[PDB]
Amino acid sequence: RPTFYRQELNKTIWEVPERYQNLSPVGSGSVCAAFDTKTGHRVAVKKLSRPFQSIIHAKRTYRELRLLKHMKHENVIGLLDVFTPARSLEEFNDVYLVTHLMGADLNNIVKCQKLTDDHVQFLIYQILRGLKYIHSADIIHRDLKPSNLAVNEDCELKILDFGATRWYRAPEIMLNWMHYNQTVDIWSVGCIMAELLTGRTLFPGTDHIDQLKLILRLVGTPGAELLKKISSESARNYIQSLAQMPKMNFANVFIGANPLAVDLLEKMLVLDSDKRITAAQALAHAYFAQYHDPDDEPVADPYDQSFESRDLLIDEWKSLTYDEVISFVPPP
Ligand SMILES: CC(C)(C)c1cc(C(=O)N2CCS(=O)(=O)CC2)c(NC(=O)Nc2cccc3ccccc23)s1
Ligand SMILES: CCCCCCCCO[C@@H]1O[C@H](CO)[C@@H](O)[C@H](O)[C@H]1O
């Protein structure tokens, strides 16, 4: 067991191993940058807030640990370390998770460099490659957006989740359809790609309904084939009253863009989620001919997420979170 040390960081206690110095807040879980003396690298440390306060907090805490322990891919956040000050299960009340510090998010990059077409290819390709891996574990991100995409000085990207969001959300999420296929994430990627291409937010909705109004103006009112799949009588009736709207020609909208990028966008920003390109399909799209390697887009090991259907006691979730902390093996 390492030896710990306590720190005050803006009204929060932080109790971390001595391995980790120069803690400097970044995020509020809350997150600090720190320097890892055992590798010499900069890290981000997340302290979970109140991990075990309710059954739902308890289950969420276990959820994040299991997910992060499973994610082993270049374009997805991975765990360098996980620790607790606790010497025993009875002591156990905080969880800390450790990852390689990436020093910027894609929001930062977007607001002060106009990306070239090659940049857009490389960045969207890596998002799709991480997303191929995430989706192959039967996980849905559900909140993909620039601020959830960490980028380094070589333009290498990792997908993560800090926990407006609405600007990149699939319109089925905002109408609470409740099924959601993985292509909700592909909607998000199309909003991100549009913005890397134009430098402008594609759908800067003011609020919830404005969001949906902006979406329908680009992609048009649901077509016959879509309206036909809507089982809720009420959802339906409303929509044919909703102005009606031509789907816009995207080639017109993204004027000077690579026509392969335009084509990819048309295949991601489809209203009907059954008709949106998948991440593995998008990787094979000709826009990414310079980056695609079919032997280097790996998928995840099976991920047991049967815990998701379970309704357990606080102490049960807590004990399970404790087992995962103990069983953790750091990467090489
Ligand atoms: C889907 C995907 C992309 C693999 C992730 C899910 C969660 C997750 O379970 N929750 C649970 C639900 S929730 O908190 O709303 C969203 C997050 C991650 N957590 C995560 O990225 N944590 C971290 C974020 C930022 C800095 C970190 C630094 C060190 C370690 C982890 C960090 S990443
Ligand atoms: C206000 C704009 C209307 C939004 C229409 C979005 C329809 C989403 O797409 C739907 O997603 C479901 C998965 O959740 C699938 O079961 C449906 O078959 C698919 O058509």
- Is residue 29 a known part of a binding site? yes
Q: What structural domains does the chain harbor?
A: 1-103+300-329 (3.30.200.20), 104-299 (1.10.510.10)
Task: Evaluate whether 211 touches 166 at the Cβ level (below 8 Å).
Answer: yes
The answer to whether 136 is annotated as binding is: no
**DSSP string for 223-260:** PHHHHTT---HHHHHHHTTS---PPP-HHHHTTTS-HH
Resolution in A: 2.1
Angstrom distance (rounded) from CA 15 to CA 33: 14
Question: Residue 64 belongs to what H/E stretch?
Answer: helix 55-70
Q: Which residues pair with 83 in a beta bridge?
A: 96
- Which DSSP category does 181 fall into? -
The whole-angstrom separation of Cα 258 and Cα 145 is 22
Catalytic residues: 161
Q: What whole-number distance in Å separates Cα of residue 203 and Cα of residue 201?
A: 6
The 8-class DSSP code of residue 165 comes to G
Cα separation, 120 vs 312, whole angstroms: 45
> Which atom belonging to ligand 1 lies closest to the Cα atom of 64?
9
CA of 96 to the centre of ligand 2 (A): 38
Q: Is residue 253 a contact partner of residue 225, using CB atoms and an 8 Å limit? A: no
Q: Is the CB of 115 under 6 A from ligand 1?
A: no
CA–CA dist 151, 292 (Å, integer): 19
- Contact in structure between 60 and 54 (CB atoms under 8 Å): no
Rounded Cα–Cα distance for residues 313 and 75 (Å):
35
* Residue 114 three-state SS: coil
> Is 282 touching ligand 1 by the criterion CB < 6 Å?
no
Q: Which of 269, 245, 318, 303 is nearest to 69 (CA)?
A: 303
* 297, burial (CB in 10 Å: exposed 0-12, middle 13-18, buried 19+): buried
Report residue 16: phi and psi, to 5°. -130, 160
79 in helix, strand or coil?
Answer: coil
Both tokens assigned to 230: 């809507």
Read off φ and ψ for residue 83, nearest 5 degrees: -145, 165
Residues near 302 by beta carbon (within 8 Å), at least 6 away in sequence? 137
Burial of 322 (0-12, 13-18, 19+ CB in 10 A): buried
Element (H, E) at 36: strand 30-36
- Residue 160 Cα, ligand 1 centroid: separation in angstroms? 6
Query: Does 105 contact ligand 1 (Cβ within 6 A)?
Result: no
CB atoms within 10 A of CB 49: 14
Measure Cα distances from 89 to 13, 152, 242 in Å.
20, 38, 56
> 76 a known binding residue?
no
Solved with: X-ray
Convert 205-230 to b/e letters by CB count within 10 Å (16 or more is b). beeeeebbebbbebbebbeeebeeee
